[PDB]
């Protein structure tokens, strides 16, 4: 299935499978609390998890995996996928994290929560890095589905099929850069720069997960968080 698509067909499938930008329950009057900001982030992420689950089903090659493998990949990478989406939404807003169209937070809002400002800065630095790189939406959807298939492929044959899909997404990335007028050296460099960022997204997820457990979470977030603890 996924190995039969072309690069443009790959981009077309990923772009159409994009989840929507959900809104928050933020009341600008209601005073800021680290319980309210937590609840606000928690209610948003829990609703985003429903769209992410149905998004993963539309990722090429994901349905071919067993139900057990689909569970494992989403359990390991759900925060990574949420973060890179947040980072991508916040590109045009320097110094601000766009959790929702009605919820823009900067550094000091992250101070309202203990130990979250350091992760805010890493998210801001990642968003700034995408801004300087002029990251395209076709490249973002490629990176986000790479995270889905890669973040749990060594934590489980069936893993061999995933690597063939991963190579297919790499062909798709090179196809986009070559179409952007980049030279062969520029294509390889930009490809490397993009995948090195996933190492940082992994670092932010592991640190955020470490703060997440040792917890007002939802029943879905608890079952996702339990997979890391």
């Amino acid at each position: 299935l996924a190995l039969s698509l072309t690069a443009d067909q790959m981009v077309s499938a990923l772009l159409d499978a994009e989840p929507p930008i959900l809104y928050s329950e933020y009341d600008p009057t209601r005073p800021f609390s680290e319980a309210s900001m937590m609840g606000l982030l928690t209610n948003l992420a829990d609703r985003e998890l429903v769209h992410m689950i149905n998004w993963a089903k539309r990722v090429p090659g994901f349905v071919d995996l067993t139900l057990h493998d689909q569970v494992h990949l989403l359990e390991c990478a759900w925060l990574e996928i949420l973060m890179i989406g947040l980072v991508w939404r916040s590109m045009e807003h320097p110094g601000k994290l766009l959790f929702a169209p009605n919820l823009l937070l900067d550094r000091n809002q992250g101070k309202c929560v203990e130990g979250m400002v350091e992760i805010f800065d890493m998210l801001l630095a990642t968003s700034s890095r995408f801004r300087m790189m002029n990251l395209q939406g076709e490249e973002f959807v490629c990176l986000k589905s790479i995270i889905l298939l890669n973040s749990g492929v060594y934590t489980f044959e069936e893993k061999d099929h995933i690597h063939r899909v991963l190579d297919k997404i790499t062909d798709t990335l090179i196809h986009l850069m070559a179409k952007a007028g980049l030279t062969l050296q520029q294509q390889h460099q930009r490809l490397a720069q993009l995948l090195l960022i996933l190492s940082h997204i992994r670092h932010m997820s592991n640190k955020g997960m470490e703060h997440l457990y040792s917890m007002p979470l939802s029943d879905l977030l608890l079952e996702m968080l339990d997979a890391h603890r």
Binding site: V50, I53, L67, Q70, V71, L220, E223, M224
Partner: peptide, 10 residues
């Protein structure tokens, strides 16, 4: 079993 397995198989 899990809520995650629930939504994935629907």
């Amino acid at each position: 079993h899990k809520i995650l397995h629930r939504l994935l198989q629907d």
